[PDB]
Write a protein that binds this ligand. Structure first.
Ligand code: HEC
Ligand code: HEC
Lengths: 134, 134
């Protein structure tokens, strides 16, 4: 298997990778601080959908509590008590991530904007329950 | 724009994310230390193709030399002198990553194994020239 420190590293890396690509979509379709490119918005959405489907469940085990990956894990222990809540939030995120990739393929800015907001809410929902605010 | 420390963080995260997914393909089709699942091999290949197409070129600027992202950047300065070599290696990696995703979709273990070896060589080619060995 993976050691705990690998699980933390790989999940921190995965989330950081998604944040870079979320930021590019935000810049092009929400803030307009970057010219809208279909191929780049699509490419960024595809990373988010791909990581969402990569089975990150395997990187969550109680032996990762308090472990340093890149940094000390910010996973809260309540993650392991609230499995109904974890499933609800994770399955919503996967569903929204897929939809974002589907609409970013052909969509205009308004459609992508709507789908992007649903993914952002899904990221935030998990953070609000299961990530330490520092 | 992004600060240098963000560029290093995002590129380290991106490569670490790809290494997790490479490791899963290796386990299932090379070492057989994990039972072969089509959907999981495909899901892992799709992450690699998606990150390969995410325009990581934007995360390489000379102001990132020696900068801490998660860790001190291991980018070598010769990256900025050997642009012909960078282009050759990067375009090969993108091409091999796409092919891996295409064959992992329907492929058997032998086809994926062949495509996986081409991606692994492409990762290594860039490391050999432009990443400090520590
Ligand atoms: C639970 C189902 C989550 C979903 C969906 C997303 N994130 Fe998250 N994130 C989560 C946890 C439990 C943690 C802490 C991981 C750890 O072990 O430390 C995180 C962390 C991040 C980070 C910080 C990464 C780091 O380098 O320390 C970022 C930038 C982040 N997450 C972003 C992010 C985005 C953009 C998401 C949707 C696209 C997203 N996360 C979803 C839990 C969950
Ligand atoms: C150049 C075109 C590259 C290709 C293709 C790949 N990698 Fe790489 N990698 C590269 C550099 C310049 C660096 C250092 C980045 C920095 O600023 O430190 C890396 C680093 C890695 C790492 C370490 C990440 C960390 O957390 O410090 C890993 C695990 C890694 N790279 C893996 C990897 C894999 C699996 C690739 C193909 C699928 C791959 N890299 C390609 C340059 C390049």
């Amino acid at each position: 298997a993976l050691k705990p420190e690998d699980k933390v590293k790989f999940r921190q890396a995965s989330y950081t990778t998604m944040a870079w690509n979320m930021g590019k979509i935000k810049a092009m379709v929400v803030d307009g601080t970057m010219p809208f490119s279909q191929t780049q918005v699509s490419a960024a959405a595809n990373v988010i959908a791909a990581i969402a489907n990569s089975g990150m469940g395997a990187l969550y085990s109680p032996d990762t509590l308090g472990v340093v990956g890149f940094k000390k894990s910010r996973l809260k222990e309540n993650f392991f008590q609230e499995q109904d809540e974890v499933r609800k939030i994770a399955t919503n995120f996967v569903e929204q991530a897929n939809k974002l990739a589907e609409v970013a393929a052909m969509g205009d800015k308004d459609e992508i904007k709507a789908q992007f907001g649903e993914v952002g809410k899904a990221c935030k929902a998990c953070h609000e329950k299961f990530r330490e605010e520092e």
